Structure 1
Amino acid sequence: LSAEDKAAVERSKMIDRNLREDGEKAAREVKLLLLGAGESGKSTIVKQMKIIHEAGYSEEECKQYKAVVYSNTIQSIIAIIRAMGRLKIDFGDAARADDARQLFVLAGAAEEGFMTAELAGVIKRLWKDSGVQACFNRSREYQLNDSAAYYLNDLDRIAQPNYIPTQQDVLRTRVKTTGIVETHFTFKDLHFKMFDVGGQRSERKKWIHCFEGVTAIIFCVALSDYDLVLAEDEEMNRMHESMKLFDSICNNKWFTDTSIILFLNKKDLFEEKIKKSPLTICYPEYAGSNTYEEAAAYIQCQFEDLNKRKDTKEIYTHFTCATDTKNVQFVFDAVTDVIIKNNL
């Protein structure tokens, strides 16, 4: 009672000061939660924020993706070849059959990225083949990686002995993470906090409320999934599952005061796909013209329509190509502004 035990009370006071200052710093930062199905682009937007608003990637960090690049590469070629079996597609040149076997021989189990002169040639022979190409064109009929062609077309560069992933290579890589991914950056005078709970494959129900009160959500959508299914339910359309998700997220009680920002991503892939495939596949009752403008607009209207508090909340749609830094740079800037004009 009243003496030297007061030495701790001043430390207690010191601690509070730190809490205070920090808590103040914590009250003027922008928190963005990325959401949306797998493969929608969340991860890329995250990496974009690091190339645009922060250090980008140093030769050091870059060489540390060299394996994933090779892995993705191999993973991609294998999936296509396998895809030829299910689709009953031949090789343009029969000698490829041997290469296919060697692909699997060399490409051992999941160690890491191998990349040898022998394996490089093999993959190059396969990718170049007309049947493989014929199959690649039907990537809508099976699960296929989006950066397949990206890496495969650049096999010569990638395969090089002294190769080093470029920031693009890094951006195009898709690594499966299970923990929450987070990134910070300062931009336009404010500090930012962006998180991706993509790989957090668990019961959403348990942790969702942890984000109640985020500044805003950026919900990504893969426009090109309109003609894709789910290799598990078969009948379930991917574009539909995303909408269900959106409906859930959009009208979610925890997000009642949060700004919603749809990123209708993969517009570049959609632009090419819509020529070939009718939106009618995804939306049977679609009587519009099968053109980018009308089709893209239809989809936009479908998701925004899900919003039930239409008079209470506003959906800030933006069309993107997450792999384009310039495009991401610009859109984010419009996002940032809407954000301040809307809130702060």
Structure 2
Amino acid sequence: DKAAVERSKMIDRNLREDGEKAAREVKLLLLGAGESGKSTIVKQMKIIHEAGYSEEECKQYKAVVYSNTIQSIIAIIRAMGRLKIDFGDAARADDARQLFVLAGAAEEGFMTAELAGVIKRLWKDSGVQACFNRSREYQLNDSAAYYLNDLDRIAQPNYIPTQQDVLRTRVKTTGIVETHFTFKDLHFKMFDVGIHCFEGVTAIIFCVALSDYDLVLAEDEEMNRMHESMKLFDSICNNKWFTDTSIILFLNKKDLFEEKIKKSPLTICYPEYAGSNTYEEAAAYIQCQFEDLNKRKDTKEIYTHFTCATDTKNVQFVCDAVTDVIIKNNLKDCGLF
């Protein structure tokens, strides 16, 4: 372990009466465009380092799971009208009407056997599936298929959200969330911000949704999501405040990216791309595109990881590697408390 050797060279604890018990602090700034996976990484730190989610905690997310599911099916059904896609079975038109009747009369996310039946039959329909497969043409929750394929379980009367159900939720974050966890005897203070108050943070973790490459901003249908993310990364990576800050890049949603890359060409995002349309070549190209935005290459190193933030095991592996980089490079700028 090169990290253990490196940290063992520190002598600053000796200057403190109870130095060996002192807390070494690491501040991590968590950045990235909306829906890039920041809240999910936050949830994973709780799961991995601070004892997960109990069942009662999971229970609080029940109506969030229903809400996300309701939103997803409605977005697809509504898109069918705008894209002129017919139901595969004309009998589904009644189910579609009933979806709006049921969502329309409720105060918040909910589930009944009646609604489940409605959504289940809609989700199985060939025309709905065809609309689903053109989701790049509208705005659809990335977790749509996850919840809709598991609808039968979610619809059971004594349904209890699993940890993965909770990780899969999309929750509207406003403002700054700060989380604390201890790992490898470091006391991490993680800020979900998505900025001069964080000058001289130990490290930045910047999240990018790989699967955004063929999508558009909800605000401006003309604006390519990935180009927006690059511009944001450019504006962060080359900012005065962050020269001694380790810049970590999470190229996230690699699972979703791998699934669509065969069907939908990278050229939609990068017209000049002439590589093959495979997971390997297209992901590499995106990595190179982002790392290129760094204007101080022989000064600043970018530490890139491909992540699936909903996958606890991958996030645990990636977190472990990122932490070794910080221990090897940044401890001299981390204070004791």
Deviations 1:50-108, CA, capped at 9 Å, x for gaps: 11111100011110000100000101110010111111111111111011111011112
Whole-Å separation in 2 of the counterparts to 1:21 and 1:283? 58
Deviations 1:17-48, CA, capped at 9 Å, x for gaps: 99999999997211111111011111111101
Aligned length: 330
Cα offset, 1:277, TM superposition: 1.3
Structure with higher RCO (Cα < 8 A, 6+ apart): 2
CA RMSD of aligned residues (A): 7.5
Cα offset, 1:233, TM superposition: 2.6
Determine which structure has more spread, i.e. the larger CA radius of gyration. Answer: 1
Whole-Å separation in 2 of the counterparts to 1:196 and 1:95? 46
Distance 1:310 1:78, change over 3 A: same
Runs of 4+ in 1 over 6 A off after TM superposition: 5-27
Deviations 1:111-155, CA, capped at 9 Å, x for gaps: 222211111111111111111111111111111101101111111
Cα offset, 1:193, TM superposition: 1.3
Which residue does 2:287 correspond to in 1?
300
Which residue does 1:329 correspond to in 2?
316
Identity %: 99
Distance 1:314 1:86, change over 3 A: same
Whole-Å separation in 2 of the counterparts to 1:212 and 1:168? 34
Given that 2:24 and 2:185 are in contact with CA atoms closer than 8 Å, whether structure 1 keeps it comes out as no
Once structures 1 and 2 are overlaid, which stretch shifts more, 288-297 or 17-26? 17-26
Whole-Å separation in 2 of the counterparts to 1:6 and 1:259? 18
Deviations 1:195-244, CA, capped at 9 Å, x for gaps: 212xxxxxxxxxx1011111111100111111112243322111100000
DSSP-derived class of the 2:170 partner = coil
Distance 1:336 1:11, change over 3 A: closer
Q: TM-score, normalised by structure 1?
A: 0.88
Cα offset, 1:291, TM superposition: 1.6
Which residue does 1:205 correspond to in 2?
none
Whole-Å separation in 2 of the counterparts to 1:272 and 1:161? 32
DSSP-derived class of the 2:303 partner = coil
Cα offset, 1:187, TM superposition: 0.8
Whole-Å separation in 2 of the counterparts to 1:99 and 1:47? 36
Whole-Å separation in 2 of the counterparts to 1:185 and 1:168? 20
Q: TM-score, normalised by structure 2?
A: 0.90
Given that 2:23 and 2:187 are in contact with CA atoms closer than 8 Å, whether structure 1 keeps it comes out as no
Once structures 1 and 2 are overlaid, which stretch shifts more, 29-38 or 9-18? 9-18
Cα offset, 1:315, TM superposition: 0.4
Deviations 1:309-335, CA, capped at 9 Å, x for gaps: 111111000001111111111011000
Cα offset, 1:182, TM superposition: 1.9
Whole-Å separation in 2 of the counterparts to 1:293 and 1:309? 27
Which residue does 1:234 correspond to in 2?
221
Given that 2:266 and 2:277 are in contact with CA atoms closer than 8 Å, whether structure 1 keeps it comes out as yes
Deviations 1:242-267, CA, capped at 9 Å, x for gaps: 00000001111222221110000011
Given that 2:96 and 2:122 are in contact with CA atoms closer than 8 Å, whether structure 1 keeps it comes out as yes
Q: 5+ residue gaps in structure 2?
A: 331-336
